[PDB]
Design a protein around this nucleic acid. Structure first.
Ligand SMILES: Nc1ncnc2c1ncn2[C@@H]1O[C@H](COP(=O)(O)OP(=O)(O)O)[C@@H](O)[C@H]1O
Ligand SMILES: Nc1ncnc2c1ncn2[C@@H]1O[C@H](COP(=O)(O)OP(=O)(O)O)[C@@H](O)[C@H]1O
Ligand SMILES: Nc1ncnc2c1ncn2[C@@H]1O[C@H](COP(=O)(O)OP(=O)(O)O)[C@@H](O)[C@H]1O
Ligand SMILES: Nc1ncnc2c1ncn2[C@@H]1O[C@H](COP(=O)(O)OP(=O)(O)O)[C@@H](O)[C@H]1O
Lengths: 257, 257, 120, 257
DNA sequence: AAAAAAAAAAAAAAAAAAAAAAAAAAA
DNA sequence: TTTTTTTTTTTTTTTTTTTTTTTTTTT
């Protein structure tokens, strides 16, 4: 069944180029060449993790000689209430280096060693709100001991937590802020996203004022909502024998959430 | 590329002789001759750590005999929540010795042994606030047992840390303060920074009011912010093919950082 | 005094180039390029230790780049009845790395990692 | 340099199919289907290690199912004086499962769990002659509690340890010899060797009376001994400029080793 | 009414001894 | 062989701080 193949294909995830993504990539590349630490602030379901992650694929570490890998960008997602030891362990795990059983001071020394051996000019920390207040001192300690840029990606809680300590705030003053979709930006994004993700036999008439209206009402500018809504509508539309997404199907999916 | 060589020179660190650095150096020489302990208190981005390093560099340990080399000055920066054993390890790692597996009492003894063997006319400890209270007791123990002076570099909170212990208040009464740059001092230094650090082929006249307002407003009298801004502005200007920093280039960095 | 200077010089150390040393050095370069193990056999007070020590200085480590140093030749002198743990300690300390505490297996893993990092 | 490229090729490692290797592979497949433990005894420098490794390469991990890797064959190389903890830990790490730090009882249970989750039809221990006698009992316990066939790859030292326990000798009765080459087998192997490893613009005529006599005197039926000889003679000849191995060069190489 | 001072409950991090068993060694 | 002798290897009791939550008080 061809429909089965399309269902399986849609149930996946794909990357669709966007302007804000390119802006973030260029800004972060500038910071990486300057070795200047910074932070990034945005709302949930805006796709900032996808931008931080898509950037790292381009700069994947490649080593041809017998010497160990030289990695320029390392990327870790801390768990809830991640402490100092837990964070160091993740840095070591990402570099495919054997964790040494021992104490926290041993973890600190080992982390400095593995980071000194490789490049690791830029470190992208996601979900920085979850980071425990005790650990930020270690983060900036690393940023000062070695010339490595540190990027703290978080929401408004990141702002709130950072502004409580003077040194951390001084270290991470420069920043980039994400926005939401609206107007022509939103319409162009919907058109581009459907052309990039949907290969349905017939057009969905997305440009129509009414479809844009209901998608705006259900989306509110959050790409993390538009992607899910349109993918579910597509799977359901194809499942009922409709090659294209239809107005009633859109209304149904929007009503469920 | 020649521009890349100039940029690499701008990225590298250097030290400019300044009024505050010389003041601290003369004070420290007096204290070590008196063998008296004291404190150094200042704000962030004031360059007091750099001044300590510049002091250490002048007193090079020269051995003119077969007997072990003698170190007159020791410098340590403890890690977060440094305990007694960690500090003793730092002392014995700074000096060219090793410590075998053993107890805290053994570490105390080995540290005292190498401290007696070495000269250690003065001991400088950065970031005093991080030290644990028991570690403070041990620092005082060393200062009282051996003819060695102890300098506790600290921020505004150093007084608060030492207010919970009457004994350190009794022995560390003398103190020196670091301040900020304002008025004529800031302007004089700025001219010196343009001529002594930057590789700018053509002078940009930073002391002029048009370019003074920007530097002064963003910097707020902190040395670190100023040097950061100037190095970055020079790098950006040379990358653009300029032999002199333009007004727009100087203004962009301030807002970005 | 002239005499004291000459006497102090005489009581020091010096090296006389010999055909034995050059022979050893050519042979060792061959073995190093071929990555083959071998033996050096000789009586005491013949200075074979000095010849090997001199071989070491010809190929010095390069740390011009920011990366860890890549010393191609390591030279150690085990003490009497040296156990395996202590041999690993010698290797790790020579290359200027911290020796993690633990069992002989931990030292073994640490030493292999360091030996892969450097040229050796 | 083209010559250096050919030399780099000659300094590499290749694999050549021999009847000895195919015999071992068929025998091992039989034992794995039968789920019966056994052992292989063969002299040093025979290449049995390489034959077992090639066998492992024949059956790659089967991730075709959605949840676990389902690797049917594992292969571990114990270190000298391998204890039970190190053995269990190597087995665990080979299956990409984290080590649950604890006591040897925890390692035992964890290893059993990961061996049950994966297929693990057969387990191969390379150079088992340095496996501690305490741990052979653990190996037998694994072979009994789980439907796993265990193959021991060791030489003459295996049996002098196995015969120290009545229980272990019953498990590994099926034995296969793995010895040297001689006569027509040796001559055929040499010609195959001269064709596969010495892609050479000029035949060295190794399949001849005197060349075979030299190689036999130096080789004594050991392929491992022969490897260095032939590869190194080819490299030396090509470095000097000779397109093939002259008899004098071969004799010189043999004298060196 | 609505901010400011007060008893349980979880959770994380670190040496310092002691015993036993095995393996190698020396006359 | 008898004993020594060490050498690992593996298996075991005390000390301290930090949140959160909640209930009474006062103002
Ligand atoms: N550039 C993009 N291309 C395609 N889908 C995207 C993109 N950015 C976000 N998405 C969708 O949004 C989700 C990712 O958003 P998320 O990483 O949760 O945002 P954040 O982590 O910044 O809160 C994914 O499920 C994906 O489908
Ligand atoms: N005398 C100096 N010469 C050059 N640069 C200086 C000097 N003093 C401070 N700086 C700048 O300030 C930074 C050092 O500040 P820092 O080490 O944080 O001192 P502190 O710990 O006292 O704040 C350096 O990056 C350096 O560029
Ligand atoms: N090539 C040499 N030139 C000068 N003196 C030498 C040379 N080789 C050895 N010696 C002398 O011999 C001593 C070193 O010999 P040593 O290294 O003990 O030999 P081995 O260790 O092989 O017994 C030194 O004290 C040195 O004076
Ligand atoms: N079938 C083969 N193909 C290629 N090389 C082989 C083969 N058999 C043996 N060799 C050579 O012999 C060596 C393998 O010997 P090894 O695995 O050490 O035997 P063991 O460890 O059983 O003594 C390798 O260096 C390899 O070059």
């Amino acid at each position: 069944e061809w429909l089965q193949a399309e269902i399986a294909r849609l149930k996946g995830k794909s990357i669709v180029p966007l302007q804000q993504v390119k802006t973030l990539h260029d800004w972060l590349d500038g910071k990486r060449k300057a070795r200047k630490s910074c932070r990034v602030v945005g709302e949930s379901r805006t796709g900032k993790t996808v931008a931080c992650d898509a950037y790292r694929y381009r700069h994947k570490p490649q080593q041809e000689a017998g010497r160990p890998p030289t990695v320029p960008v390392v990327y870790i997602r801390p768990h809830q209430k991640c402490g100092p030891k837990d964070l160091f362990k993740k840095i070591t795990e990402y570099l495919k280096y054997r964790v040494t059983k021992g104490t926290v001071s041993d973890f600190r020394d080992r982390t400095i060693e593995v980071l000194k051996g490789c490049g690791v000019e830029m470190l992208i920390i996601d979900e920085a709100d979850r980071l425990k207040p005790e650990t930020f001192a270690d983060v900036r300690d690393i940023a000062e001991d070695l010339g490595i840029a540190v990027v703290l990606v978080g929401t408004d809680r990141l702002d709130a937590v950072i502004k409580r300590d003077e040194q951390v705030l001084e270290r991470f003053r420069a920043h980039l802020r994400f926005g939401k979709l609206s107007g022509e930006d939103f319409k162009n994004t919907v058109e581009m996203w459907e052309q990039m993700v949907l290969k349905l036999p017939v057009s969905s008439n997305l440009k129509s004022k009414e479809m844009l209206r209901i998608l705006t009402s259900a989306t509110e500018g959050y790409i993390g909502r538009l992607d899910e809504i349109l993918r579910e509508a597509a799977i359901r539309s194809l499942s009922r024998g409709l090659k294209k997404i239809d107005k009633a199907v859109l209304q149904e999916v929007a009503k469920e959430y």
